Each structure stands twice: as structure tokens, then as C-alpha cells.
């Protein structure tokens, strides 16, 4: 199915306290493959996955050169935003940037992203057409007028539609045994007791990849977010993911309830009900 | 300035069998700003060989990290994640519930 | 990434139209033309971005090809002052500009009434010492560099008296020697058979 | 908004030199190039952003620094045996977008200072025959024997600089196309009407500014030291 | 591979 490559950059100002923290991570799908951390001693782009270690010195030297360039840019950007918002100099602020591309089943371009946040809020985003910008506020309109006048978008369009797909393709064949797998969710159900009148039913999916999953609870009534509490998908740490979902039920008819699991690993969506 | 508290999940990498080697995980996500401090506790005491993943973030821009340590669960032993963030007036302890 | 310009040198007559091309294999998201005069920095002419687009500057028309892999520079009714070196450049994927090597344009004037002549001129502060001025010759006339090693001969240049609305080509030859005279100065050059050589 | 300085520079081989380039255009990105004989530009070094720089096509034997947004100094060390060139700086609002070029700097590195000479300058009066044949008078100025090729030529009439009727050679003559350090010659012409030439009151001067040695450089050959100086020659109208 | 050109806000 669809695939994606994403770079995530964070830069954090540490005021009357010195130079900014800069962290960059690259992903192919739900798998990290590179990092750079201004605070590490190495000052190098570093491998984080087995199938990228096979790249040669020139790949590492370029990636290192280019990520240090990004880091100075994000450094100037902290000072510039401080100014757009007349914030004083004693606060710690955050700039985050994301970019990359999705390919479809056939590995041809589907979608591109390039967006920024400041202090946790949307600041500027390239739009799905890759031709114009969405500024969230009038500070972000300054940025926008500056990047239109210097035609940033066209240049980003060539990279997103172009180079970015070529890299994802390259990687999708280097990391074939890792990246082009799917693990189907392993499932099972727990049953407790809320004191003594009603019990919770919890539905578990374990060691699946990639991360997208759907769990819904149904009743021979129908659907109910009657606290179907749903936890964020979480990493097991080995490459796979976990998720759970619980509905609360009257403690004498648990068989009315079914857990449906959908994952691109499952030939057909699983249905689970409580074996008493 | 937007701020958010971390969601905190504490769990093992594999079904917790006594006697069997495992990883204890503390997953914190949804938080802003990024500066965070997480310790893992054994019977109330700090565990020292704790590792973590690289700072990353979500679609909504909030951050996430995974803290983890190799361990071997036993019948008696008790574990916990302890979290400190600017949104919290008191580090929050969250206990390893070996089924929920 | 590569930008090929053609042709390297182009020499036309005042009044004629011309076109110069800049080609690549790869799409360029923006493109620029410059003109450089010798001993000077290139002057920026235009920036094009949209495929198909057409911009005008003075006597110049610039075009960006529809697939954005080519540009052309067209001049209508060229004038002597259009002379210079033309360069295209394009956005580089590593934070620079990709430059083609140039087209050198020379725009030669129409000499309405050519009167080719060679004059000896004497130094203002002496007996001895002189030079030979070859002057008022038509524009296809090529002046070649010296035969001997201590005869010195300059490139032809255009002189413009816009007061008398008048243009003339010329060149200058001199020698340290003793056999060298204005009759033989330009022996190495093909010279109009009706060239005036006074007594 | 881009300035390079100075226009002309001269150094003995092995004597390290730094070229300056400043801009108040507010441009993030800066570039250095060199250009040679009737040729094109080659990228030396550039910098997309402050505190960052990276190599161009011909980096070896050069260095740069970029600590202030407005400035991008280029050091020419005992490089490649390479250094005599026209050096051009440029800047652009962001990297990859359109560049604006400074006026450039002409750097010559000689083998020995005994090779530096000022120009001799002479003016040649128009001939009787041209005058009777065309009713125009041509003066020729010849600056000969200079090294380095760092000269600026100008014509003056009756105490003021003139531009109409002046054609100066775009390029100098190498007197000996073989040596890399041969001396040079340069000619210029001024044509005026015969009536104007034939007035004895009219004064014509051919002025040559030469850039050579400074006090920096001490000197011990027998001849006068070839410093930066103006050399002139003049002629006056001839009544017939 | 990350962008080879950078630009400021």
C-alpha cells in the first residue's frame, strides 16, 4: 500500500542560557532511520536503522552538511519570530518543521507536505496543490509575502514531487525485509469487575505494524462511545505497536458486545467476543 | 503560549510472565513544550540504566517519547513511571498495572 | 544539473533580429538572464518562473519553455549597445545558481559611406615616433594580428560621434623597428583594394 | 547594495590576501566567483545563511568566513598556482534565487616586484591628409609598457572630461603573449571635427591612472619606484 | 535525503 517519508525538526531556544537545542529525525513510515542532535558530541547525522548503515561516507557527509545548514536557519528563525511577536528575550520558544512525501501502491507521487509550527500552533503550511501557502496569522503573512516574492513554493514542488520520491523508492528497496513487511495484530480480551454491578471489557491488539489500526466496539444494539475509552497507539519498542479499547457493560451480558479490528495485515477484519 | 500535559502509559514490551526477560516502557505523549523528565521506579526507587528514543512529534504538533529499561518481572516486585513537566505542580507517579 | 548555452559567439549587423538559447535536461523552478560587459559584474536582466511565460526589457524578449527546461533570449533590431556577454542561470538544488558559459554578442554598425584609408600620425613631442591609423573601413573587414613579433596591432574598435551622427571603425599599428612603414603595416590583413594611402 | 574593495590589488607570490564584500541588501545568501580570459564564472565558495558556508567547484587554496550577515571575506592563500583573476561577489535574498553582483576586484600576483612598471604615454596628432580627405581629425593615445594591467584611461579637452568621440580599447595588448608577466600597451582614439582641431587654443590631454606599488613595499632597483600615479600626455590645436 | 537549500522565515 501507500508509503511515506517524513522529516521532523525541532528547535528550542534556551535564553540567557546559550545556544538552541536542535533535533532532527527522519522516518520511512512508522520506522525511524536517522537522527541529528545538536547536543550529542558527534555533530553528525547518525544511522538509526540497520538498512541505512549500508550508505557510504558521501551520503553521510552530505546529510551532515545539509542538516547543519537547517540548524543555523532554524537558529536565525527563533530570533526573527521573537521579533515578529515582540516577545522579550527571557522566554524559551519552540520552532517545529515537518516535510516529506507520500507515494501510492505503485510508488508514484501521491502527496506532499511542508509546514511549520511556533510555540505549538500552526504558523505556515504549503497547501495540497503545492502552489500556495496558508498563513495562520498576520506574522505568518510576512513570511508568506517573502516566500512568494522569492518563489520558494516552486522549488519545494520540484523536491517533493521529485527528489523526495526518488529517495523513498531507494530506501524502500534497501530496507525491503523491514519496510515492506506487515505484522497482523494479535488479539485478546480482558474482563474485570467495577466493584460489583457492572464490568469493563477491554480489547487488545499487539505487535502489529504499521501503526494505523481501527478498534471499535459494537453491540447487537449498535455503536456507542458510552465510554469506549481508546488509548493512543503505542510503540512496543521492538518495531511493533499496541492499542486497546474498553467499553463499560452491565455485569451479566458480555456476549452482546463485539470488538472489530481492522488492519492492513488482516486478510479479513477480526471480530472478537468474550469467551466466558 | 500553548501548553499540554503529557499522556502517560506504563507497560511491558511483552506479556509479563514471571521469570522472563522483558522491557518496561513508559510512553509519554501529547505534551508541549518539549522539556520533560521521566524516571522509572522499582519498588519506589530510581532505576538507573534507563534509555530513551529521539524527540519527535505528531500531526497536532505535540511531542512524544518512549523511556525503557530491560527488566525481569517477579511476583512481588512493583514498578512505576514518574513524570515531571512544566504543566505539573507535582511529578506524577503512574503505576505499572500488569493487566490494564 | 546543467545549463548549455548556444552559440558561443554571435556577430550580427545593427538592425537585425536575434535569438539565443539556454537548454537543460532537467526542469528548473526559476531562471535568470544577465549581461556582462568586460571588467564589470553581470547585470541582472530578468527572472522567469512560469512555464510558457514571456517578459520584455527594452529590445529584449525572454521566454521560458512550457516544460521549464529551456529559455530563449530574443533581440529585436539590435544596436551596437546590445553588445556584451549573455548568461543564463537556474535555481540549484544545493542553494546556488547553475550557470551556462555564455553567448558573446557583437553588434556591428552599418557604415553608410566607407572611405577606407591608412594615415601616418606623428608624436606630439618629437621627431621620429609615429603610428598608422587604418580607419573608416566597412564592417566585414577583419584586421589580423601582426606578422612580425615587434610590430604591434590592435583589435578594431567602433568610434561614435553622435554629434555628427557618425560611426567609424579603426585600428592602430606601430613598431619599434626601422623598415616598418604605413604602406606595409597591415600586409597581414585582407584590406579593401580601394584603400587610400596618401604621399 | 553590494560593494567590493578595492577595485585593483597586487601582491608578490606567496603573500596571502583577503578580499572584501559587504552588502546592505538584507540578503541571506552570498557567493564568490572567479573569471579568467574571455571566459566564464567559476564558483569558489558560498554561504546560504550566517555561520554556514560550503565549497563551490574551485574551492582549493581559498577560505571564507561568514559571521555577520553583511559580509563575506575571501582569503586567497598560497592556493593552487592560480591566483591572478577577476573576483566577483554576489548575494541573493535566499539561496538559489536571483543574484546581484558586486563590481568585482582585479587581483594580480607577480613573481617579483622588479616586474612592475608605469606606462609611458604619448599622443599622436592627426595628419594633414585625413583632415583634407574627411574634414575630421583623429588623435591617438598610446600607453605602453605597463605592468600590471591595472590602468584607467581618460581624455580631457580644455580642462574637462569628454566622452563623445572616444573609443578606448576594451582590452590591453600583451607586448609578449608568451610571458605570464609581460608588459602591456593600450590605445585610445578621440575624433573631433577639423575646425575644432585647427584652433590653436584647443588643448587635448590623454590621462592614465596607474595602480602599482604602495609604501607597504620597499624598493631597491636603480629606477624610480613604480607607485600608483597619473601619467599624462597632451597636444594642442594646429592652425594650418 | 533532506533539502539541499535552506531559507529563512
Amino acid at each position: 500500500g501507500s508509503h511515506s517519508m517524513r522529516y521532523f525538526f525541532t528547535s528550542v531556544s534556551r535564553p540567557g542560557r546559550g545556544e538552541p537545542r536542535f533535533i532532527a529525525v527522519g522516518y520511512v513510515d512508522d520506522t525511524q532511520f536517522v537522527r541529528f542532535d545538536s547536543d550529542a558530541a558527534s555533530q553528525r547525522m547518525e544511522p538509526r536503522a540497520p538498512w541505512i548503515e549500508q550508505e557510504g561516507p558521501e551520503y553521510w557527509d552530505g546529510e551532515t552538511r545539509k542538516v547543519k545548514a537547517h540548524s543555523q536557519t532554524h537558529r536565525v528563525d527563533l530570533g526573527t519570530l521573537r521579533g515578529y511577536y515582540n516577545q522579550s528575550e527571557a522566554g524559551s520558544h519552540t520552532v517545529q518543521r515537518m516535510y516529506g512525501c507520500d507515494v501510492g501502491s505503485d510508488w508514484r507521487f501521491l502527496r506532499g507536505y511542508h509546514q511549520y509550527a511556533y510555540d505549538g500552533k500552526d504558523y505556515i503550511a504549503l497547501k495540497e496543490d503545492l502552489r500556495s501557502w496558508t498563513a495562520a496569522d498576520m506574522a505568518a503573512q510576512t513570511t508568506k509575502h517573502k516566500w512568494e516574492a522569492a518563489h520558494v513554493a516552486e522549488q519545494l514542488r520540484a523536491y517533493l514531487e521529485g527528489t523526495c520520491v526518488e529517495w523513498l523508492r531507494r530506501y524502500l528497496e534497501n530496507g525491503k525485509e523491514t519496510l515492506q513487511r506487515t505484522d497482523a495484530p494479535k488479539t485478546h480480551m480482558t474482563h474485570h469487575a467495577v466493584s460489583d454491578h457492572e464490568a469493563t471489557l477491554r480489547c487488545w491488539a499487539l505487535s502489529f505494524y504499521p501503526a494505523e489500526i481501527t478498534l471499535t466496539w459494537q453491540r447487537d444494539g449498535e455503536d456507542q462511545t458510552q465510554d469506549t475509552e481508546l488509548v493512543e497507539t503505542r510503540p512496543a519498542g521492538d518495531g511493533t505497536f499496541q492499542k486497546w479499547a474498553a467499553v463499560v457493560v452491565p455485569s451479566g451480558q458480555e456476549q452482546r458486545y463485539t470488538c472489530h479490528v481492522q488492519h492492513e495485515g488482516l486478510p479479513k477484519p477480526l471480530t472478537l467476543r468474550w469467551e466466558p | 503560549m500553548i501548553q499540554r500535559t503529557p499522556k502517560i502509559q506504563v507497560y511491558s514490551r511483552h506479556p509479563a510472565e514471571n521469570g522472563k526477560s522483558n522491557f518496561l516502557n513508559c510512553y509519554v505523549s501529547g505534551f508541549h513544550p518539549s522539556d520533560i523528565e521521566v524516571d522509572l521506579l522499582k519498588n519506589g526507587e530510581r532505576i538507573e540504566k534507563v534509555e530513551h528514543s529521539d524527540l519527535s512529534f505528531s500531526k497536532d504538533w505535540s511531542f512524544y517519547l518512549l523511556y525503557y529499561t530491560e527488566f525481569t518481572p517477579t511476583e512481588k516486585d512493583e514498578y512505576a513511571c514518574r513524570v515531571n513537566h512544566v504543566t505539573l505542580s507535582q511529578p506524577k507517579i503512574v503505576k505499572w498495572d500488569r493487566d490494564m | 544539473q546543467l545549463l548549455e548555452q548556444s552559440p558561443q559567439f554571435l556577430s550580427i549587423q545593427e538592425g537585425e533580429n536575434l535569438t539565443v538559447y539556454c537548454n537543460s535536461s532537467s526542469v528548473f523552478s526559476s531562471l535568470q538572464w544577465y549581461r556582462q560587459e568586460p571588467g564589470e559584474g553581470p547585470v541582472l536582466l530578468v527572472t522567469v518562473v512560469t512555464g510558457g511565460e514571456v517578459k520584455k526589457l527594452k529590445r529584449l524578449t525572454f521566454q521560458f519553455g512550457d516544460a521549464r527546461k529551456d529559455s530563449s533570449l530574443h533581440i529585436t533590431a539590435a544596436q551596437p549597445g546590445d553588445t556584451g556577454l549573455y548568461l543564463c542561470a537556474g535555481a540549484g538544488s544545493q542553494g546556488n545558481l547553475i550557470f551556462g558559459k555564455g553567448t558573446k554578442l557583437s553588434v556591428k554598425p552599418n557604415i553608410q559611406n566607407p572611405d577606407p584609408a591608412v594615415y601616418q600620425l606623428r608624436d606630439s613631442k618629437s621627431s621620429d615616433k609615429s603610428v598608422c591609423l587604418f580607419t573608416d573601413f566597412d564592417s566585414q573587414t577583419n584586421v589580423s594580428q601582426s606578422k612580425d613579433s615587434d610590430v604591434y596591432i590592435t583589435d578594431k574598435t567602433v568610434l561614435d560621434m553622435r554629434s555628427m551622427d557618425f560611426k567609424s571603425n579603426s585600428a592602430v599599428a606601430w613598431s619599434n623597428k626601422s623598415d616598418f612603414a604605413c604602406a606595409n603595416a597591415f600586409n597581414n590583413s585582407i584590406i579593401p583594394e580601394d584603400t587610400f594611402f596618401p604621399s | 547594495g553590494i560593494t567590493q574593495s578595492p577595485k585593483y590589488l597586487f601582491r608578490k607570490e606567496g603573500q596571502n590576501v583577503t578580499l572584501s564584500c559587504e552588502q546592505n541588501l538584507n540578503h541571506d545568501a552570498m557567493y564568490w566567483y572567479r573569471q579568467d580570459p574571455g571566459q566564464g564564472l567559476r564558483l569558489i565558495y558560498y554561504s546560504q545563511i550566517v555561520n554556514d558556508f560550503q565549497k563551490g567547484d574551485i574551492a582549493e587554496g581559498y577560505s571564507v568566513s561568514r559571521e555577520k550577515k553583511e559580509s563575506f571575506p575571501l582569503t586567497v592563500t598560497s592556493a593552487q598556482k592560480n591566483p591572478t583573476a577577476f573576483y566577483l561577489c554576489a548575494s541573493s535574498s535566499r539561496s538559489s534565487y536571483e543574484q546581484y553582483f558586486g563590481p568585482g576586484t582585479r587581483l594580480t600576483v607577480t613573481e617579483d616586484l622588479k616586474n612592475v612598471f608605469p606606462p609611458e604615454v604619448a599622443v599622436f596628432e592627426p595628419s594633414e591628409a585625413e583632415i583634407s580627405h574627411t574634414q575630421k581629425a583623429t588623435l591617438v593615445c598610446l600607453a605602453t609598457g605597463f605592468y600590471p594591467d591595472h590602468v584607467e584611461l581618460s581624455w580631457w579637452v580644455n580642462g574637462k572630461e569628454v566622452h563623445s568621440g572616444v573609443s578606448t580599447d576594451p582590452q590591453p595588448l600583451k607586448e609578449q603573449p608568451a610571458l605570464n608577466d609581460s608588459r602591456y600597451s593600450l590605445s585610445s582614439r578621440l575624433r573631433v571635427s577639423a575646425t575644432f582641431w585647427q584652433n590653436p587654443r584647443n588643448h587635448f590631454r590623454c590621462q592614465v591612472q596607474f595602480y602599482g606599488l604602495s609604501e607597504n613595499d620597499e624598493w631597491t632597483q636603480d629606477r624610480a619606484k613604480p607607485v600608483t600615479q597619473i601619467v599624462s600626455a597632451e597636444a594642442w590645436g594646429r592652425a594650418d | 535525503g533532506i533539502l539541499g537549500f535552506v531559507f529563512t522565515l
Side-chain angles (χ1 to χ4, degrees), chain A residues 1-223 225-276, chain B, chain C, chain D, chain E:
Chain A
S2 297
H3 289 108
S4 71
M5 180 177 80
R6 303 264 199 270
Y7 288 99
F8 299 93
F9 307 80
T10 309
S11 178
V12 173
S13 68
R14 25 210 207 176
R17 204 215 216 191
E19 313 303 331
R21 184 27 145 2
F22 178 78
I23 273 142
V25 295
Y27 280 82
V28 181
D29 295 327
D30 295 313
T31 310
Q32 193 185 346
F33 79 98
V34 278
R35 70 150 138 188
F36 179 93
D37 173 4
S38 59
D39 281 1
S42 59
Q43 292 307 303
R44 299 220 104 219
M45 181 82 114
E46 301 197 1
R48 287 301 265 171
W51 54 264
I52 193 84
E53 331 216 11
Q54 14 229 50
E55 295 292 355
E58 260 131 322
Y59 173 89
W60 290 110
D61 272 282
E63 295 315 287
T64 291
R65 173 219 315 337
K66 292 181 275 158
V67 90
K68 276 177 193 197
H70 281 79
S71 152
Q72 302 298 137
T73 300
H74 293 82
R75 197 173 136 165
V76 170
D77 291 347
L78 286 150
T80 308
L81 283 163
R82 217 204 53 87
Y84 293 162
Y85 288 96
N86 193 36
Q87 281 149 353
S88 59
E89 332 211 66
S92 182
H93 296 88
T94 299
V95 188
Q96 286 157 277
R97 177 194 206 194
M98 190 261 257
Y99 67 80
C101 54
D102 307 357
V103 297
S105 278
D106 49 28
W107 290 18
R108 265 135 73 184
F109 169 87
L110 205 58
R111 198 160 175 175
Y113 305 81
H114 182 278
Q115 48 207 230
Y116 283 79
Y118 181 62
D119 289 336
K121 325 192 294 185
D122 292 321
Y123 172 83
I124 205 162
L126 195 58
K127 290 189 64 147
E128 212 194 356
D129 70 4
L130 309 188
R131 288 169 40 60
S132 39
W133 298 100
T134 302
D137 63 14
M138 250 218 65
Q141 287 286 318
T142 305
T143 297
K144 176 215 243 222
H145 300 174
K146 177 176 171 136
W147 284 1
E148 301 175 320
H151 307 277
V152 169
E154 297 83 338
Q155 209 170 356
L156 287 176
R157 195 192 206 182
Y159 169 86
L160 290 170
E161 305 196 346
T163 320
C164 183
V165 175
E166 288 169 335
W167 281 118
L168 176 51
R169 283 183 203 141
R170 170 127 133 96
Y171 297 151
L172 280 163
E173 281 277 310
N174 296 357
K176 194 201 295 60
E177 304 277 308
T178 281
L179 308 179
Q180 297 178 48
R181 106 275 228 185
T182 92
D183 290 310
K186 273 168 267 149
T187 45
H188 74 112
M189 211 173 303
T190 56
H191 166 260
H192 296 289
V194 175
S195 73
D196 243 37
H197 62 317
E198 282 168 31
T200 56
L201 282 162
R202 183 163 19 245
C203 186
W204 289 90
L206 312 174
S207 61
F208 56 95
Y209 183 98
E212 176 73 17
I213 189 106
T214 316
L215 316 170
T216 338
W217 269 104
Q218 290 214 320
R219 205 197 64 157
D220 26 63
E222 229 313 277
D223 268 29
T225 337
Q226 264 52 51
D227 60 24
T228 161
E229 47 171 0
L230 230 176
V231 296
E232 198 156 291
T233 309
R234 65 197 193 198
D238 56 347
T240 60
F241 297 83
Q242 313 182 163
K243 202 171 163 71
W244 69 246
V247 264
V248 171
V249 304
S251 223
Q253 23 92 136
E254 296 102 306
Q255 53 227 226
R256 294 189 71 182
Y257 300 77
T258 53
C259 196
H260 296 70
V261 186
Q262 296 114 307
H263 195 258
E264 73 195 86
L266 295 169
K268 51 187 191 59
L270 254 24
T271 301
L272 252 92
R273 97 279 282 146
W274 181 241
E275 298 287 316
Chain B
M1 181 58 65
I2 212 35
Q3 304 193 142
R4 310 158 171 289
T5 39
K7 304 203 181 53
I8 296 145
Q9 293 196 64
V10 195
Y11 55 105
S12 57
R13 174 186 311 188
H14 303 272
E17 167 150 352
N18 290 334
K20 237 208 143 67
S21 208
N22 208 323
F23 288 80
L24 171 77
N25 296 332
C26 184
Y27 188 54
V28 295
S29 65
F31 61 96
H32 199 286
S34 55
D35 181 21
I36 206 168
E37 168 181 307
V38 176
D39 284 332
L40 304 170
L41 304 174
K42 177 167 177 182
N43 294 310
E45 273 148 20
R46 223 183 132 287
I47 306 171
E48 318 194 48
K49 290 145 167 291
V50 178
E51 283 194 279
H52 68 283
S53 72
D54 317 292
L55 191 55
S56 188
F57 56 86
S58 291
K59 196 268 299 185
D60 67 8
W61 304 104
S62 60
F63 289 103
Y64 64 80
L65 283 169
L66 174 77
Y67 286 77
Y68 64 101
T69 193
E70 199 160 343
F71 91 124
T72 298
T74 61
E75 211 173 32
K76 281 280 209 312
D77 278 341
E78 138 184 355
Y79 295 92
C81 186
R82 183 230 62 115
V83 192
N84 199 209
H85 193 244
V86 75
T87 53
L88 308 162
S89 45
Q90 260 202 168
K92 179 176 283 177
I93 302 159
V94 181
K95 208 221 144 177
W96 182 41
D97 190 340
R98 75 146 82 186
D99 204 345
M100 88 169 257
Chain C
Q1 278 174 281
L2 281 156
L3 272 207
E4 230 191 36
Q5 284 193 252
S6 197
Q8 288 189 331
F9 298 91
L10 178 60
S11 171
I12 49 146
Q13 277 297 111
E14 160 177 45
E16 292 173 321
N17 302 338
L18 66 96
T19 298
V20 305
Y21 323 78
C22 166
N23 290 122
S24 156
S25 258
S26 51
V27 165
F28 271 91
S29 67
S30 50
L31 204 131
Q32 272 91 25
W33 288 86
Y34 296 83
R35 183 170 112 239
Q36 179 187 20
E37 296 296 323
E40 278 166 23
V43 174
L44 177 68
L45 303 173
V46 89
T47 281
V48 303
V49 170
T50 303
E53 100 174 275
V54 165
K55 285 194 181 156
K56 286 182 60 88
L57 176 69
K58 282 125 209 323
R59 287 173 276 100
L60 279 20
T61 311
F62 299 96
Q63 216 217 28
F64 203 20
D66 298 345
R68 288 176 303 143
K69 295 179 178 181
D70 309 291
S71 193
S72 67
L73 160 330
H74 183 255
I75 314 196
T76 291
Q79 291 180 42
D82 288 306
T83 294
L85 174 64
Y86 294 82
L87 295 152
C88 62
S93 66
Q94 314 306 115
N96 69 183
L97 279 190
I98 307 289
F99 280 90
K101 323 291 127 46
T103 295
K104 197 184 291 174
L105 174 68
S106 314
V107 181
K108 297 193 284 193
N110 317 305
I111 305 312
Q112 176 145 310
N113 296 289
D115 204 324
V118 184
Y119 306 104
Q120 194 162 106
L121 296 63
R122 51 336 190 297
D123 168 37
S124 81
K125 291 208 303 160
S126 61
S127 329
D128 186 359
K129 261 223 179 190
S130 58
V131 287
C132 299
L133 186 52
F134 174 41
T135 203
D136 295 321
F137 53 88
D138 79 284
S139 273
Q140 325 71 251
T141 294
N142 277 342
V143 178
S144 324
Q145 23 197 26
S146 66
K147 192 55 163 67
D148 195 275
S149 140
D150 41 47
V151 178
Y152 305 102
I153 323 194
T154 76
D155 290 327
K156 74 173 187 192
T157 38
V158 188
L159 193 162
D160 189 10
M161 305 166 73
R162 51 209 179 290
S163 43
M164 290 173 67
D165 315 25
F166 176 88
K167 280 169 182 78
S168 56
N169 295 300
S170 78
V172 166
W174 71 99
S175 195
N176 191 22
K177 282 281 199 189
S178 178
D179 46 11
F180 164 84
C182 287
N184 69 29
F186 300 93
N187 264 36
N188 211 10
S189 271
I190 295 156
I191 237 67
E193 221 53 16
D194 49 57
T195 312
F196 185 47
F197 291 92
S199 279
Chain D
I2 340 130
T3 46
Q4 288 177 243
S5 49
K7 198 180 179 220
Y8 299 106
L9 271 168
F10 180 79
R11 294 285 183 280
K12 174 215 253 65
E13 77 95 12
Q15 222 197 139
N16 277 32
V17 76
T18 296
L19 322 204
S20 97
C21 177
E22 319 263 71
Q23 51 91 194
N24 58 348
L25 290 163
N26 231 49
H27 281 186
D28 285 316
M30 289 192 80
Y31 304 81
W32 273 105
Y33 299 89
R34 68 172 279 161
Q35 188 177 35
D36 275 286
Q39 262 169 232
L41 300 157
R42 288 184 307 162
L43 176 72
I44 292 165
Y45 254 104
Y46 63 111
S47 161
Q48 297 198 48
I49 183 95
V50 71
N51 309 291
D52 197 82
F53 63 82
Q54 59 200 108
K55 293 169 168 28
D57 317 75
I58 182 57
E60 318 309 322
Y62 294 104
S63 50
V64 292
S65 87
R66 185 89 197 275
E67 299 189 29
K68 311 288 160 207
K69 196 192 178 178
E70 301 75 3
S71 169
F72 195 37
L74 173 84
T75 304
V76 184
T77 85
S78 329
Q80 159 66 104
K81 297 303 296 302
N82 85 0
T84 295
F86 183 51
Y87 288 93
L88 273 166
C89 181
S91 73
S92 57
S93 62
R94 74 189 182 84
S95 53
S96 297
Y97 195 49
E98 78 200 11
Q99 282 164 214
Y100 289 85
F101 278 88
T105 302
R106 303 211 41 208
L107 165 65
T108 294
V109 176
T110 185
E111 287 298 291
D112 209 287
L113 315 190
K114 321 256 191 305
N115 286 353
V116 181
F117 288 86
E120 300 137 293
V121 179
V123 183
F124 298 81
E125 274 151 295
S127 56
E128 69 307 346
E130 170 195 27
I131 284 162
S132 99
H133 203 58
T134 78
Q135 291 311 174
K136 289 161 200 58
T138 305
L139 304 88
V140 160
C141 184
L142 257 214
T144 60
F146 54 89
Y147 182 89
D149 169 18
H150 292 173
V151 294
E152 290 165 296
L153 193 159
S154 66
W155 283 105
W156 299 68
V157 177
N158 285 326
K160 113 271 163 44
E161 200 179 358
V162 307
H163 280 118
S164 53
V166 167
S167 51
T168 299
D169 289 306
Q171 231 78 287
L173 262 188
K174 258 188 187 165
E175 299 185 342
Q176 316 199 38
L179 179 50
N180 233 146
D181 294 40
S182 158
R183 307 162 65 161
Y184 294 86
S185 275
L186 190 71
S187 75
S188 186
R189 302 136 287 277
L190 168 66
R191 206 158 189 178
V192 290
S193 59
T195 57
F196 192 88
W197 166 255
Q198 290 184 310
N199 181 352
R201 290 327 113 113
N202 291 333
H203 177 211
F204 313 79
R205 163 157 97 89
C206 182
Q207 183 174 300
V208 165
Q209 173 75 64
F210 173 73
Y211 302 87
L213 302 166
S214 217
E215 315 284 76
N216 282 77
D217 309 323
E218 72 245 44
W219 176 259
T220 181
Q221 185 150 350
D222 325 49
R223 63 189 165 93
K225 70 177 296 207
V227 292
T228 304
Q229 88 210 64
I230 300 204
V231 184
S232 350
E234 54 210 2
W236 270 267
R238 261 271 203 336
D240 70 330
Chain E
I2 64 175
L3 284 162
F5 55 100
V6 300
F7 45 95
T8 50
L9 309 177

